[PDB]
Design a protein that fits this description.
2 copies of one chain form a homodimer.
Chain A (H helix, E strand, L loop, with lengths): L5 H7 L11 H13 L6 H9 L2 H24 L1
Helix pairs in contact in A: 2-4
PDB class: viral protein
Keywords: Capsid, Inhibitor, viral protein
Assembly: dimeric
């Protein structure tokens, strides 16, 4: 329903989140992205991985698994 | 040998415009959907085009990968 411009997306992504900065849900998504593509993380990203609150991080990861399931349903029904 | 070199190479490919390998494309679409960030027109156009059977296989590996990450958290003290 909504679209982004390429320029709009690149403004939002910053060098800071290569160092693992950012909100938890954003950080979790970036970690998952690298893992999908088997891309090693940076030390800064890696250091935040141990920092995160496990309870809050687990719930965010479950939401991703749910969203992957929604995408699978979409692709199956086609 | 690098996170940043690998990431910039994919950006140069045009991955934000929808270009690149299917696995790279699916990972980016999944990434945006996780954060509910509106995709680009080029990404959105390919979302309909993609070969569904191969795409579903890629998504199944993502689900297995998300489960592995959940195992890592429980493994930590």
């Amino acid at each position: 329903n909504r679209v982004s411009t390429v320029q709009q997306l690149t403004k939002r992504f910053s060098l800071g989140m290569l160092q693992g900065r950012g909100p938890l849900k954003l950080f979790m998504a970036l970690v998952a992205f690298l893992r999908f593509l088997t891309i090693p993380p940076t030390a800064g990203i890696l250091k935040r991985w141990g920092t995160i609150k496990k309870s809050k991080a687990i719930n965010v990861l479950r939401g991703f698994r749910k969203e992957i399931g929604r995408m699978l349903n979409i692709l199956n029904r086609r």
